[PDB]
């Protein structure tokens, strides 16, 4: 996250940390056995890592969780980034409590001009690189479709939104993607893709979860 602040540890009781030997992308905890998360960011062997704030060090409130089953969206297409979505089983239950906690689907897709939450542990700058221990939080507003699309000619299909800042300097970043856009306490977002980080005219560009619940609900149920 580039322009961002410092959540706090266990505020965003939700974001997880998916770990292959160290962190390499963010997710969200859904329900108790089940994260979502963005499917440019699959490989095999993937710990789960919920309750975090400091990635490197043990404070107290983790749990560690192997994935048993990984499942790509069937149409995600990885030249384009449509459907950029992803679902990944634990192997048993977390435990839920005020610190690791699940976010909800949302029932309808949020509008342009509202206000969410995007998190993660992804590099801090637009030029070079720092990455953080703690979490890092950004609040950005959803671009409307028209700015989206001007943005980036040619490459916005209806599985996707623009959120940020077209003036430049806050934005998710390398390391963020896969993890949350919330909005209204519901999760509409996963951090996809973008052009360099906190770029002039290049906001980030989210998949949009609203179009994803029936297949969700519909893989968990029989998964
Ligand atoms: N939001 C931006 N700029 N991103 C998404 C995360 C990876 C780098 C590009
Ligand atoms: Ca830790």
Redesign the pocket.
Known sequence: IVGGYTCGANTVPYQVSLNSGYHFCGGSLINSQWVVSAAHCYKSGIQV?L?????????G??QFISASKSIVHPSYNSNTLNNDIMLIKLKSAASLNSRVASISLPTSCASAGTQCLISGWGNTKSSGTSYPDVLKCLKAPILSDSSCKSAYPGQITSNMFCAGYLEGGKDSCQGDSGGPVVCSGKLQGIVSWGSGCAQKNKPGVYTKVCNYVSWIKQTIASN
């Not at 309750?51 to 404070?59: C, K, Q």
Request: glycine share 8%; aromatic share 0%; net charge negative.
């Open positions: 890592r309750g975090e704030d400091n990635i490197n060090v043990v404070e409130n983790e």
